[PDB]
Amino acid sequence: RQIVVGICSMAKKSKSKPMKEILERISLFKYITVVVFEEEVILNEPVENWPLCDCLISFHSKGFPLDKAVAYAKLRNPFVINDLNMQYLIQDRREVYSILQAEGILLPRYAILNRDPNNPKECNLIEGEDHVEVNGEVFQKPFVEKPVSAEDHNVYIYYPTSAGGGSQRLFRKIGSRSSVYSPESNVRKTGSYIYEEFMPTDGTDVKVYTVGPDYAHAEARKSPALDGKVERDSEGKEVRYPVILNAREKLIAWKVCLAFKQTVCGFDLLRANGQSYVCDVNGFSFVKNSMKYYDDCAKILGNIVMRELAPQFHIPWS
Ligand SMILES: O=P(O)(O)CP(=O)(O)O[C@@H]1[C@@H](OP(=O)(O)O)[C@H](OP(=O)(O)CP(=O)(O)O)[C@@H](OP(=O)(O)O)[C@H](OP(=O)(O)O)[C@@H]1OP(=O)(O)O
Ligand SMILES: Nc1ncnc2c1ncn2[C@@H]1O[C@H](COP(=O)(O)OP(=O)(O)O)[C@@H](O)[C@H]1O
Ligand SMILES: [Mg+2]
Ligand SMILES: [Mg+2]
Ligand SMILES: [Mg+2]
């Protein structure tokens, strides 16, 4: 009898090129059958009617009913590749940062500004023309201001007077742009934010993609904060630069993968001041447009499934 690997995510993710490429390769495993849960079923059917699986690959994106996935996993008790309860915490930057700190992972110095919706005026924020003070902690410009919702990508950077003042407003990339300059020098006055020190990079972000704690692919892309113009190649794909992680960074990836219990996990590294700082943990994410990654990821996931489940299925596996 076959080991069933169930894929439970929104259709946009389940039918994505990287997903289809990887699932095709996982299916090549002799004792593995892949079942992709239909979006209509995920959204409209009670969990009791969802397909059975022995191993569940499931992850949140916009519109995904995480409560249902959690309930399904509790009902069927499959082997879970990416822990579902942790995906609530991944949606909250405050929770992400707390986990990183607890794990001895270097991250930007930061402070949380929580605003009670009823009292916007009763906050712990003092603003100077070249700095902010949050719960008593001072951040000189440049500093970064992030919505506490990790799903909210309206991240702002504030320039010091010596650099011309104003701000850089980042957003989910659309077409040719990932950010825009604003003459606004004052911080946002409604909502809750994390304020953090600006880490000076060479102008790129390092994007890391784990497949288990012992495998991580990295690449670099232009930081959206630079000027906001997206670099695209002859085919319309965003330009990426080769990266090889050093020993320290390979350990960071190991830590992030295990700490968040996300076998497949994307996160960002800022290479600054001779160190590497995690600034964002995104959970489930595949590398795009790398055939070798497709090969590696499918092989590792298949091996994880076989290692974990082959004994109870009485299947030979060395
Ligand atoms: O796919 P589209 O519609 O053309 C927009 P895009 O090309 O910017 O795709 C990005 C995707 O956005 P949506 O799926 O929400 O549209 C992100 O989605 P999200 O996680 O920021 C928001 P969602 O999960 O709610 O969709 C994330 O995709 P993924 O990480 O979910 O695979 C990201 O991936 P990276 O961060 O760059 O690795 C993708 O960027 P790219 O494909 O250029 O790499
Ligand atoms: N502390 C920081 N110092 C310098 N740049 C930062 C810092 N935090 C974020 N950035 C820049 O802003 C971008 C978006 O921030 P990030 O925390 O990755 O949010 P998102 O969840 O929207 O991707 C990063 O890729 C990086 O270029
Ligand atoms: Mg097969
Ligand atoms: Mg990021
Ligand atoms: Mg993020």
UniProtKB/Swiss-Prot annotation:
<feature type="modified residue" description="Phosphoserine">
    <location>
        <position position="182"/>
    </location>
</feature>
<feature type="binding site">
    <location>
        <position position="146"/>
    </location>
    <ligand>
        <name>ATP</name>
    </ligand>
</feature>
<feature type="binding site">
    <location>
        <position position="172"/>
    </location>
    <ligand>
        <name>ATP</name>
    </ligand>
</feature>
<feature type="binding site">
    <location>
        <begin position="280"/>
        <end position="282"/>
    </location>
    <ligand>
        <name>ATP</name>
    </ligand>
</feature>
<feature type="binding site">
    <location>
        <begin position="172"/>
        <end position="173"/>
    </location>
    <ligand>
        <name>substrate</name>
    </ligand>
</feature>
<feature type="binding site">
    <location>
        <begin position="285"/>
        <end position="288"/>
    </location>
    <ligand>
        <name>substrate</name>
    </ligand>
</feature>
<feature type="binding site">
    <location>
        <begin position="196"/>
        <end position="199"/>
    </location>
    <ligand>
        <name>ATP</name>
    </ligand>
</feature>
<feature type="binding site">
    <location>
        <position position="268"/>
    </location>
    <ligand>
        <name>ATP</name>
    </ligand>
</feature>
<feature type="binding site">
    <location>
        <position position="153"/>
    </location>
    <ligand>
        <name>ATP</name>
    </ligand>
</feature>
<comment type="similarity">
    <text>Belongs to the histidine acid phosphatase family. VIP1 subfamily.</text>
</comment>
<feature type="binding site">
    <location>
        <position position="221"/>
    </location>
    <ligand>
        <name>substrate</name>
    </ligand>
</feature>
<feature type="binding site">
    <location>
        <position position="223"/>
    </location>
    <ligand>
        <name>ATP</name>
    </ligand>
</feature>
<feature type="binding site">
    <location>
        <position position="93"/>
    </location>
    <ligand>
        <name>ATP</name>
    </ligand>
</feature>
<comment type="function">
    <text>Bifunctional inositol kinase that acts in concert with the IP6K kinases IP6K1, IP6K2 and IP6K3 to synthesize the diphosphate group-containing inositol pyrophosphates diphosphoinositol pentakisphosphate, PP-InsP5, and bis-diphosphoinositol tetrakisphosphate, (PP)2-InsP4. PP-InsP5 and (PP)2-InsP4, also respectively called InsP7 and InsP8, regulate a variety of cellular processes, including apoptosis, vesicle trafficking, cytoskeletal dynamics, exocytosis, insulin signaling and neutrophil activation.</text>
</comment>
<protein>
    <recommendedName>
        <fullName>Inositol hexakisphosphate and diphosphoinositol-pentakisphosphate kinase 2</fullName>
    </recommendedName>
</protein>
<feature type="binding site">
    <location>
        <begin position="205"/>
        <end position="207"/>
    </location>
    <ligand>
        <name>ATP</name>
    </ligand>
</feature>
<feature type="binding site">
    <location>
        <position position="207"/>
    </location>
    <ligand>
        <name>substrate</name>
    </ligand>
</feature>
<feature type="binding site">
    <location>
        <begin position="12"/>
        <end position="13"/>
    </location>
    <ligand>
        <name>substrate</name>
    </ligand>
</feature>
